[PDB]
Design a protein around this ligand. Sequence first.
Ligand SMILES: *[C@@H]1O[C@H](CO)[C@@H](O[C@@H]2O[C@H](CO)[C@@H](O[C@@H]3O[C@H](CO)[C@@H](O)[C@H](O)[C@@H]3O)[C@H](O)[C@H]2NC(C)=O)[C@H](O)[C@H]1NC(C)=O
Ligand SMILES: *[C@@H]1O[C@H](CO)[C@@H](O[C@@H]2O[C@H](CO)[C@@H](O)[C@H](O)[C@H]2NC(C)=O)[C@H](O)[C@H]1NC(C)=O
Ligand SMILES: *[C@@H]1O[C@H](CO)[C@@H](O)[C@H](O)[C@H]1NC(C)=O
Lengths: 132, 122, 122, 535
Amino acid sequence: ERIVLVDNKCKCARITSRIIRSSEDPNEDIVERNIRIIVPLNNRENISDPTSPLRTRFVYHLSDLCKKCDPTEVELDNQIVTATQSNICDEATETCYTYDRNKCYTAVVPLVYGGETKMVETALTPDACYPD
Amino acid sequence: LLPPPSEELALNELVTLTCLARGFSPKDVLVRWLQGSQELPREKYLTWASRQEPSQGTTTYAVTSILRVAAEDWKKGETFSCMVGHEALPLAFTQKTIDRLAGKPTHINVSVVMAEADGTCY
Amino acid sequence: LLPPPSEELALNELVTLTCLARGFSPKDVLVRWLQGSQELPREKYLTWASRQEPSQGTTTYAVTSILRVAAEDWKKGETFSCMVGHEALPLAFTQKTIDRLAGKPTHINVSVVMAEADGTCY
Amino acid sequence: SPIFGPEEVNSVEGNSVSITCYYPPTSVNRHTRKYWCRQGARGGCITLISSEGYVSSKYAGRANLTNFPENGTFVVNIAQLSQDDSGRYKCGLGINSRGLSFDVSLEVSQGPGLLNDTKVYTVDLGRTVTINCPFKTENAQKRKSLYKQIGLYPVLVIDSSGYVNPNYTGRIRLDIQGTGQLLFSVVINQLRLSDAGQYLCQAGDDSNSNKKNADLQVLKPEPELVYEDLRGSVTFHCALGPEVANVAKFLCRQSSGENCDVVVNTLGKRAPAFEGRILLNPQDKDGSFSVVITGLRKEDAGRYLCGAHSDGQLQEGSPIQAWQLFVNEESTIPRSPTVVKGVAGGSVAVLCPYNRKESKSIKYWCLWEGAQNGRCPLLVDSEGWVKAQYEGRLSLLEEPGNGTFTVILNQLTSRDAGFYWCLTNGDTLWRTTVEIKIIEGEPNLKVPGNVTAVLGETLKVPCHFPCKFSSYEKYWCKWNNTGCQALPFVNCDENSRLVSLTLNLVTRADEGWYWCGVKQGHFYGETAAVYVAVE
Ligand SMILES: *[C@@H]1O[C@H](CO)[C@@H](O[C@@H]2O[C@H](CO)[C@@H](O[C@@H]3O[C@H](CO)[C@@H](O)[C@H](O)[C@@H]3O)[C@H](O)[C@H]2NC(C)=O)[C@H](O)[C@H]1NC(C)=O
Ligand SMILES: *[C@@H]1O[C@H](CO)[C@@H](O[C@@H]2O[C@H](CO)[C@@H](O)[C@H](O)[C@H]2NC(C)=O)[C@H](O)[C@H]1NC(C)=O
Ligand SMILES: *[C@@H]1O[C@H](CO)[C@@H](O)[C@H](O)[C@H]1NC(C)=O
C-alpha cells in the first residue's frame, strides 16, 4: 500500500503495490499487489434512463485498467520528441460503470405545454451540472 | 420514488407508485410522469398541494403524487419515471426511475470477473 | 523461453511466444519448435540470424525466434517447446517448455465486503 | 484527504468556539453538502448540523453553519459548551461513508467555582512576569523566602538575599521601591516550561507553618493555518515584539523525533534543498519581516516556527511564533518545465503561468541572487523598463495570453545559469521558478558577426535555418524598450534557407539591435541577434 499504479474512475478500480525486502536470504523478497473494486448495485447498463435492467455482470481486464494514453516527452540525443504510451485506445466507446464526481450527465425528455411539445433538458447528477 | 407495496402485487389488478419531494424552500413545484419515454396526460394521476413540514431548523416544504398502472405491464418490464421542476435545481428538472428489478427485488445477482490479475500492469 | 504478453491474451486472436539463446562461442546453432511431441514444419515461424554481443573480453553470440499460435490452443492447455542444437553441448540438444500455470502466484487473498459496512477512504 | 483544519481546539464551559474547514474551490465542491458530525463508538458517524437546512435536537438554538464559497471555507459555531461535548469530530463534504473528511479533537475543561483564593498572571514564554507576595513589616528583619513544592514539601532552594536555585541560574533580579511599605516583587525573564506552577511564597516568617497560594500559567502559541497547493508559494509573517528587535532571528521546521531543523537564519545559513526558491526580507522599524517559499512540494507539510535567539537555533528561553501548513496537491496550477536547456550563443523561452481572473495585472521577471539572504533585482517589467546590462538581449511578450506570458533571453553565456522568478501584481500570487542550464553544442539559426554600415549605400544581412524549421514561420524585428515589432522588408528567399532584410538608407535613426525569429503563430521559438553600427 505505498505506490499507486492506477486509480481509474470509469470502472472505479484502484491498484497499489509495494516492495518489502528482507535482509536475510537476499535471493527472495516479496512483492505485493492490492486491488479494490467498488460494485454499484443500482446502475443501468447504458447510462440513460429507460435502457435495460440493472447491470448484473461486471468485467475488469487488467490491461484496460492500467492503460495510459496521454502523450509524454522523451529526450533522445538533444531533442524533445512526443511519444504515445499504449497500443490500444483508438477513439467515447468505453462503457462506464459508475458516474464520475467531476463530470455531469444530462438527458432529454419531451413534454407538452398546451400546444406543441418542447425538448426539455434534465440533470441526472445535480451536484455537478451547475452553470458557472 | 417508491416501489409498490408487496401486498398489491398478488391481487393482480393495478399497482401504485409514489413520488415524494421534500425539503425545498419556496413552495412552487411541478410533477409530471412518463411511461417508457412518453409523457402521460394529466388526468391519469393525482397531485396534492405544497405544505409546510415540522421544523428542524429552516422552514421547508413537501408534496406527493400517485399513479396507478396495469399489473401486467409491471411484470412485462416497462419503466416509469417521475419528474420534478423547481427554482433551485441546476437545469430546472430532475428525474428518478423504477421498474420491477430495481426496488424490492427479492433477488440480488451479481457477477464480478477479474481477468488477468498477474499481468504486467502498465 | 518467454510467456506471452497479457495485452494479446485479452483480445482472442493469435498469441506469440519468444525463444532466446545467448552466450555461445562459435556462431552456429539450430532452432526448431515443437507442439507437444510434434515438430512443426519450418515455415510457420521466423528466426533471425546469429550476432555477437557487447562484452568484457570474451566474445559470445546470441539468437532469437518467435512462433504465433491461436488463443484457443493456449487456453486449452497445450504445451510448446523450443529446441536448440550446438556443438559445445555434450548431448547436442537442450529443451525448454511452456504453457499456462507456469508463472502462477502462490498466495491469493479475497475479501468480500457486504452492505451496511462501507468504509471507503478517499 | 484534501480537507484540512485545526487538529486540536480547547475552551472552557459557557464559552463559544469557531471552527473553520477548507476544501478545493471546484464547482462540485461549492454546491455539494457540508456536514459536521460526531464520530462515536459503535460504527456510526451521526450528523449534528448540516448545510442543507438540518439542525439537530441537541444543537437547537446554540449553533449554525455558514458556507463561504469564494474563500473555499465553511465555519461552524457552538455556543454554551459542556462536558458531554468532549470527543472527536469531523468536517466533510458529500456522503459520510466515503472519506472526504478531516478529524478534529475537541477538549473542554471545568472552570473554577466558589474557589476564588487565586492570583493569576498570564504570560507567553519569553516575556516578563511578577509574583507578588504580602510583605509584612511585623517581620521587618526576616528573609523573604519562596520555596518550590515537589509533592507536599516546600523545598528550601530559593532565598531572597543572593541565594538562588541551581536550576534558576542567572536570571532572578528584584527591585526596591517599598522599603517601609509592602512593596517588593520578583521579575523573571525568559520563562521556561519547567518554570510553571504555584510556589510557596511569603515575606518574613512567624514559626507556625503559614502558607500562601499564587500561581502562574505560561502558554505555548497557537499556529495560524495556511492552505497552499502544489507548485505555488507561501508567505509567513513573523511579528515578534521590539524587546528582541536586535537579536539574531531564525525560522525552522518541527520534525518527528523532537528535532527542529533550520531552514534560514539571519547569520547566513540555508538548507541544501531550498536553494534558489527562498527569500528573507529586511525588517521594518518595529521588528517584523517576511519569508517567501515558492514551488511547494508534497513534503513541505508540517509545523513551522519563527523566533529570536542569540546563536540562530531553537533553544529554550526564546520567544516563538507558529504556523501549520497543508499542501493541497489536487491543484489547478498548470505544470511547467522545471529545467530548460540552451547552448552558448542560443536563446531560451519560458512559459510563465498566472490566473485567468487577474489578467489586468503587471508582470515582472527576477533573477535570484542568493548572496545576502535572497533578493530579486527586477530585470524587465510589463510597462516598458529593462535593466542596463541586459540591453539588446531581453524582452517580455504577452502572447499567447489567457494563462501564460513568455520572455526571451538570448546571447547566452555559461555564467547565465541560475534560478529565475516570475511574479504578477494581482491578489493571489503563484511565483514560478525555472532553472536555466548551459550544455554545449551549436546554435541552430546562423547569422554573421557584428555588422557595420557603409556611408551612402545599402546593407543586407542573411540568416539561415535548418530543415526541421521548414514549417515554422520566420520574422525579423528591431528591439526597443516595449519589446520588438515585426518588419514587413524581408523576403524569405529560399525554401529552406536565407531569410534576409535590407535597410534602404544609412542614417542613424535605426542604429540598434536586431533579431531573427521563428514562431508557430502564438508560441515563440529560438532566435539570434546581431548589432548594427554606422561608421
Ligand atoms: C446510451 O443512451 C443514450 C441516450 O439515448 C444514447 O445517446 C443518444 O442516442 C441517440 C439515439 O440514436 C442519438 O440520437 C440522435 O439525437 C440527435 C439530437 O441530439 C438527433 O438529431 C439525431 O437525429 C439522432 O436521433 C444521440 O446521438 C445520442 N447522443 C446524445 C444525445 O448525446 C447512447 O448512444 C446510448 N449508448 C449506447 C451504447 O447504446
Ligand atoms: C472569508 O472568511 C473570512 C473568515 O474570517 C471572513 O471574514 C469575516 O467574515 C465575517 C462574516 O462572517 C465578517 O463580519 C468580517 O468582517 C470578515 N472579516 C474579518 C477580518 O473578520 C470573510 O468574510 C470571508 N470572505 C468573504 C468574501 O466573505
Ligand atoms: C449564527 O451565525 C452568525 C453568522 O451568520 C453568527 O454570528 C452567530 O454567532 C451564530 N449564532 C449562534 C452561534 O448562536
